[PDB]
């Protein structure tokens, strides 16, 4: 029994690093290293998946993303191809809600948290600053859909801060000038914005056009917004979140291969490891080892990688990971705290807030105006057409005192 393992990566030198990883795994079953690069036109990759790897006897696969801006079409061909057999696989990179759910893809596990869960930090970011009123902006994509889902569900479960309005919109928008108008005239003053990158200008340059960033204002966005605007048009003082892994597949390899090794030790007790069916053409045989391999990888806890305590959630992404509480310094970047799994850990610096005051502004202003409406009902409501001057004529009661009219 020599369980060969296959990988696909974007940098061949780090594929050699993966060969070092499989040597260290030989230091520890029996492994054999094999791997393939990636090319454009994902149909060629859906060829090479079995033209190279599925042609062998594989019980776990490695997948990672390129730098190309596809970022969604990159993991799917291999995903579909292997999934035909329910083969557990390990993703290493961009964590959009591709296989966030078990519906399309079945037994995939990843090492990077998907941009959804960054909501929860915001949640406790509230329980730090006692804010209980909140505006939310979301575009009606699947990413933002799940975003609203997770956020509203967590907040309702918190029953405290209650949501105020779920303002949805569309990606392809040149101007959201109409929506921010009704937005920035409501009660609260804290705003969360999770959408695609280039939307930020569409928001930001529209916000300052409405001066929606001057003072009595607080913002909170996702990392894509941070990058795309903190280079382009970030209104200073806005706050976001930052992840530690960033863009490098190296440490992911370490996080990955260790649990791959620790797995095979969980079926060296009953010899139900019969054979991974080599070759794509030839059999619709369901390698029913898949459910067992998945149920065990869902709990193969280790501490191999650079980051201690790399484990899984019920989704198979990075669980109990670590973020850094990013912040901007009017053109510059800093970390003023490391959110450690669940710990409330800030860090010392000049924590500015929009406009540039060392105070933490309150939630709401509680305006003095109140739009009131009412219906036509003679014995409770009398309406009269105005006079030629623009009012309606005064009159006295039978007692002689005046009567109000508005």
């Amino acid at each position: 029994k020599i369980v060969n393992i296959g990988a696909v990566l974007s940098t061949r030198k780090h594929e050699q690093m993966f060969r070092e990883a499989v040597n260290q795994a030989n230091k520890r079953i029996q492994l054999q290293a094999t791997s393939v690069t990636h090319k454009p036109n994902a149909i060629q990759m859906a060829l090479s998946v079995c033209e190279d790897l599925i042609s062998s006897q594989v019980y776990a696969i490695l997948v990672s993303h390129p730098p190309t801006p596809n970022d969604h079409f990159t993991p799917t061909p291999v995903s579909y191809t292997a999934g035909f057999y329910r083969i557990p696989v390990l993703g290493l990179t961009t964590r959009m809600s591709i296989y966030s759910d078990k519906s399309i893809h079945l037994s995939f596990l990843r090492t990077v948290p998907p941009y959804s869960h960054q909501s929860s930090v915001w949640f406790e970011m509230m329980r730090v600053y006692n804010w209980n009123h909140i505006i939310l902006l979301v575009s009606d994509d699947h990413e933002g859909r799940a975003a609203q889902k997770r956020l509203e569900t967590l907040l309702e479960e918190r029953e405290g801060p209650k949501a105020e309005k779920v303002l949805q919109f569309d990606p392809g928008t040149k101007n959201v000038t109409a929506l921010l108008m009704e937005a920035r005239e409501l009660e609260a003053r804290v705003i969360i914005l999770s959408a695609s990158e280039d939307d930020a200008a569409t928001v930001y340059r529209a916000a300052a056009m409405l001066d929606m960033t001057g003072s009595g204002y607080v913002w909170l966005v996702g990392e894509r917004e941070i990058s795309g605007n903190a280079l382009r048009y970030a209104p200073d003082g806005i706050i976001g979140l930052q992840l530690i892994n960033g863009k490098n597949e190296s440490a992911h390899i370490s996080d990955a291969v260790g649990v791959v090794a620790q797995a095979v030790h969980e079926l060296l007790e009953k010899e139900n490891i019969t054979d991974p069916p080599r070759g794509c053409v030839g059999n619709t045989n369901i390698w029913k080892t898949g459910p067992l391999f998945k149920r065990v990888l869902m709990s193969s806890k280790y501490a191999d990688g650079v980051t201690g305590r790399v484990e899984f959630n019920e989704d198979g992404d990075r669980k109990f990971a670590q973020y850094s509480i990013m912040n901007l310094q009017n053109r510059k970047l800093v970390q003023v705290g490391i959110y450690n799994g669940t710990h409330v850990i800030p860090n010392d610096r000049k924590i500015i807030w929009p406009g540039g005051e060392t105070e933490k502004p309150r939630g709401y202003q509680m305006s003095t105006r109140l739009k009131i409406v009412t219906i036509h009902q003679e014995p409770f409501v009398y309406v009269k057409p105005t006079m030629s001057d623009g009012t309606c004529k005064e009159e006295f009661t039978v007692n002689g005192d005046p009567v109000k009219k508005v």
Binding site: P40, N41, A42, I43, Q44, A46, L47, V49, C50, E51, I54, T76, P77, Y80, T81, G83, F84, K102, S103, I104, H142, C280, V281, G282, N283, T284
Partner: protein, 354 residues
């Protein structure tokens, strides 16, 4: 071109009868029907053959049917759909009987009914025989939130027992069994175990009647023994649909879509050259005209689909597990209307008054 694939162990040679029915009329652009069948072929073989043949014979539209090797095949072209921008039609097979949502950057609607449609037909059956109360339990099968939301909304315009999702809590959940009618939205593999536990707790014969959707049994012939000697199910596929009739429906759909296309602004789907490289990605950026290929008619009825893939008001039938462990066509369904050609199914008095 407009091609057809008929991989599977069947009467494909006979089914080419529909070639002349295609050859005479109902084709403005007269198409090039051509079969490329296969054996029990693997996903990768399926992909390479599909794009290779679509590239060779100059194909611009396709429809296929096969043995129910796995529902995953429905997913497998969802990728290539936008990868080459061409209408796809899964038909006549359990392979093409599952739902595949949210891939809608491209084509490939399907046939048969929707979750909502079949569910409303279940409710229609429930009224037409006055079954007042109902219970329901299900699992993580696709459409659980959809089903619970649909049934919780269509009751605010019933006599439910309870909605239950399952994962020693099984018995404490089954103890709430209170309805005179029991429902389940599942498949046969788990249905074995669930009818087992049902015999373990719930009644099976005279005292309860089991009703389930089309894709619980999948095919039409197998039967795990734990099922009661009666099952009200609903489908259309393998009881009236002739394969030549189905492929005729398909070629009609594509030809009338081509009619709408060449009429609106007179653009033919450009021939995708290669399934290989970025030089073929040149046409991949050309215009897309998918939507307006959906309001077209022939053989009388309209064939409008929603933006997701299901036709409106399908033609449907209701079957029942008889005593010989077989199914029988007992209910007609047409034009959002039901016809139950069989009364209550075996304290039995018959009263009379004036």
């Amino acid at each position: 071109g407009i091609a057809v694939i008929l991989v599977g162990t069947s009467d494909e040679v006979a089914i080419k009868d529909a070639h002349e029915k295609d050859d005479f009329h109902h084709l403005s652009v007269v198409p090039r029907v051509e079969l490329v069948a296969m054996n029990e072929t693997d996903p990768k073989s399926i992909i390479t053959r599909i794009c290779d043949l679509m590239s060779d014979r100059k194909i611009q539209g396709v429809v296929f049917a096969d043995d129910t090797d796995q529902e995953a095949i429905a997913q497998i072209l969802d990728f290539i759909s936008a990868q080459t921008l061409t209408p796809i039609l899964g038909i006549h097979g359990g392979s093409s009987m599952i739902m595949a949502d949210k891939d809608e950057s491209s084509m490939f609607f399907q046939f048969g009914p929707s979750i909502e449609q079949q569910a409303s037909v279940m409710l229609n059956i429930m009224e037409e025989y006055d079954w007042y109360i109902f219970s329901i339990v299900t699992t993580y099968f696709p459409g659980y939130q959809d089903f619970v939301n649909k049934i919780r909304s269509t009751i605010e315009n019933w006599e439910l027992e309870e909605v239950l999702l399952l994962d020693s809590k099984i018995q404490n959940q089954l103890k709430k069994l209170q309805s005179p009618i029991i429902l389940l939205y599942c498949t046969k593999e788990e249905a074995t175990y669930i009818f087992e536990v049902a015999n373990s707790v719930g009644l099976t014969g005279y005292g309860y009647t089991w009703i389930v959707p089309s894709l619980v049994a999948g095919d039409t012939d197998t039967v795990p023994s734990e099922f009661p000697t009666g099952l009200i199910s609903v489908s259309y596929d393998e009881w009236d649909y002739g394969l030549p009739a189905r492929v005729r429906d398909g070629i009609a759909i594509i030809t009338t879509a081509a009619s709408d296309m060449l009429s609106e602004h007179s653009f033919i789907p450009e021939p995708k050259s290669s399934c290989y490289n970025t030089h073929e990605k040149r046409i991949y950026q050309s215009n897309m005209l998918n939507r307006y290929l959906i309001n077209v008619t022939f053989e009388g009825r309209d064939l409008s689909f929603s933006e997701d893939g299901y036709q409106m008001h399908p033609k449907l039938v209701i079957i029942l597990l008889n005593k010989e462990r077989k199914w029988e066509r007992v209910g007609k369904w047409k034009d959002k209307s039901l016809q139950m050609k069989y009364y209550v199914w075996p304290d039995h008095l018959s009263i009379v008054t004036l």
